[PDB]
Amino acid sequence: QSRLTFVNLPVADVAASQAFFGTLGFEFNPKFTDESCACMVVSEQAFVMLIDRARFADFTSKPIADATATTEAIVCVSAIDRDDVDRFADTALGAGGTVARDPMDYGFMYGRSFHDLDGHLWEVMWMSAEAVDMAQPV
Amino acid sequence: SNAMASQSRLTFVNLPVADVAASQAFFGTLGFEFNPKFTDESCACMVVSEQAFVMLIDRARFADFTSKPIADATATTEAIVCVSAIDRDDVDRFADTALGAGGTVARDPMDYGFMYGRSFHDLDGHLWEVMWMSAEAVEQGPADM
Ligand SMILES: [K+]
Numbered sequence: 470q471s472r473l474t475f476v477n478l479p480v481a482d483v484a485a486s487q488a489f490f491g492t493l494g495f496e497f498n499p500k501f502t503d504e505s506c507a508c509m510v511v512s513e514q515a516f517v518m519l520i521d522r523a524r525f526a527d528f529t530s531k532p533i534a535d536a537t538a539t540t541e542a543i544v545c546v547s548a549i550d551r552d553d554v555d556r557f558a559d560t561a562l563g564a565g566g567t568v569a570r571d572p573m574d575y576g577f578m579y580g581r582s583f584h585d586l587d588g589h590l591w592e593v594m595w596m597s598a599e600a601v602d603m604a605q606p607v
Numbered sequence: 608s609n610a611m612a613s614q615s616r617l618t619f620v621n622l623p624v625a626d627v628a629a630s631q632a633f634f635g636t637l638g639f640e641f642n643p644k645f646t647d648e649s650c651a652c653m654v655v656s657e658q659a660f661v662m663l664i665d666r667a668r669f670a671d672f673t674s675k676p677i678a679d680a681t682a683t684t685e686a687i688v689c690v691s692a693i694d695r696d697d698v699d700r701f702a703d704t705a706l707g708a709g710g711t712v713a714r715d716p717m718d719y720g721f722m723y724g725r726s727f728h729d730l731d732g733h734l735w736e737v738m739w740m741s742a743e744a745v746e747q748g749p750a751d752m
C-alpha cells in the first residue's frame with residue numbers, strides 16, 4: 470500500500486530554512502512545525518522536515534554530514550512546465566541558494582539544480598505529459 | 608476552496624547505491640513496487656506512493672548529479688527517509704524484515720504511545736525510519752499529545 474514520505478534534513482537555522490522554502494512557494498504544517506522542526510508540505514503524501522542540527526543528532530549514531538563537502542542524497546521535485554522549473558530555480562538562487570550542476574535540457578524534459586542554505590542538493594524537473602509507466606512487482 | 612492548498616509536486620529522493628539489483632531486491636522485500644519505465648541496470652525507481660519515489664542510483668552514475676564527493680552513509684548522516692505505517696504491527700513487520708535482510712540497527716525503537724517508530728541503515732548505510740502515528744496525533748500534532 471502507499472505510505473507517506475517524510476524526508477528529514479538537518480538545518481543550522483530552522484527559521485531561515487522555513488523562510489527560504491516559503492519563498493519557493495511551499496506551505497508548512499503548523500501542527501508539525503516549531504522552533505526545532507519545520508514541516509514543509511510537498512504534496513498530501515510527501516513532506517520535508519527541516520530539523521535543527523541539535524535535534525537531528527538525536528536520530529543518528531553517526532556525525533551529521535556537511536552537505537557542502539559531500540552529497541548523500543538529492544531531493545527532486547516535479548514542475549508543471551519549463552517556466553516553473555526556471556522560476557523555482559531562479560527564486561532559490563536569489564534566496565541564498567547556490568549553483569549545483571548545469572541545467573539538463575532535452576526539450577521535452579528540463580531540470581535545474583541548486584544547493585540550499587545548508588548545502589542540501591535539490592533538483593526541480595519537468596517532463597512532457599506526452600512522455601510522463603506505473604508500479605509493478607519486483 | 609480546495610485551491611487553498613498550493614499546487615502539489617511529486618517528490619523523488621535520489622540515493623547512491625553500490626549494487627542496484629541488491630538494493631531493488633531489498634526494497635522489494637519490504638513491499639515496494641518499482642516503475643519499469645524509470646528502472647534499468649543503473650537506476651531503480653522505487654514507488655512509495657502516487658506522489659513519492661526513491662531513485663536507487665548506481666554510485667558511479669550518481670557522481671554525475673553532484674560536484675561533491677559522494678558521502679559514505681556508514682560514516683555520516685545527511686538525511687533520513689521516514690515512511691508511514693498503518694499500525695504498530697506494520698512498523699514491527701517492516702523493521703524486522705529490513706533487519707533480517709541485511710539492514711542494521713540505527714537507534715532504539717521510539718514508542719511515544721501516539722507515535723511508534725523504528726529505524727535502520729539500509730545496505731548502503733542510508734538511514735530509514737518506519738513510523739505509525741495515531742489519527743489524533745496526525746490532526747493535533749505531537750506537541751498537543
Ligand atoms: K543549529
Ligand code: NA
Nearest residue numbers: 526527529530
Ligand atoms: Na547522534
